[PDB]
Amino acid sequence: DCSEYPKPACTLEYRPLCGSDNKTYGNKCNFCNAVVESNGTLTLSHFGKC
Amino acid sequence: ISGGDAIYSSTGRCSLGFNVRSGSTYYFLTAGHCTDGATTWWANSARTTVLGTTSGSSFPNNDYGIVRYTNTTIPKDGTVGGQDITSAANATVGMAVTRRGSTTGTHSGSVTALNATVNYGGGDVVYGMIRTNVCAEPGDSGGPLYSGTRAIGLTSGGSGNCSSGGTTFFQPVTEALVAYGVSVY
Q1: Helix (H, G, I), strand (E, B) or coil at B12
Q2: Looking at the structure, do residues B120 and B146 belong to the same domain, yes or no?
Q3: For residue A6, what is the nearest residue in chain B, using CA coordinates?
Q4: Which Cys pairs does UniProt list as disulfide-bonded (chain B)?
């Protein structure tokens, strides 16, 4: 659920998610911004670090 | 433990802002969005070394929180990494500043605007923030923004990253020091 994105800025607490690109995203706001940027190509692999 | 070091809650990792005190009671400042919902803080990922418990939190609208040290042995340095901090000051446009955080370490840059409104969504709006061209990334929240020996702000949020460049907004530290009746040492 990245419906509320993109966002101009994100808070910066670390709670990691692992993208389908095998990149660890630092928090959900960073991940959703990257999903937007990918035009919906990027997906979530699992919660936590990759 | 000093400004910029990692701090762990039950939900995630932030950075310690500044060590402060009131009389004999030692506390640390961090971001409000880190202290919201958090009770206990630890110094390691294993959550084996206690730091203390949240004493106050102001987020959204502002973005500052304060944690009361409950750990008697841990050194509570009045520094940012090795750097001495002796006073608090207000940011000005053009001021060269430095940030330290637990993900990216130390990065420098300048204040580019004051009193900015940042909308983090879901009704999480913060006002009166310092805008800079320093980068920051997840984990860096609550870390210090300083200028030589002067304490300026606490990391709130931003966009971009350290590899391509970013924009980061900080909560003015004087507002927090006044709110809690604490001082840098």
Answers
A1: coil
A2: yes
A3: B121
A4: 14-34, 135-162
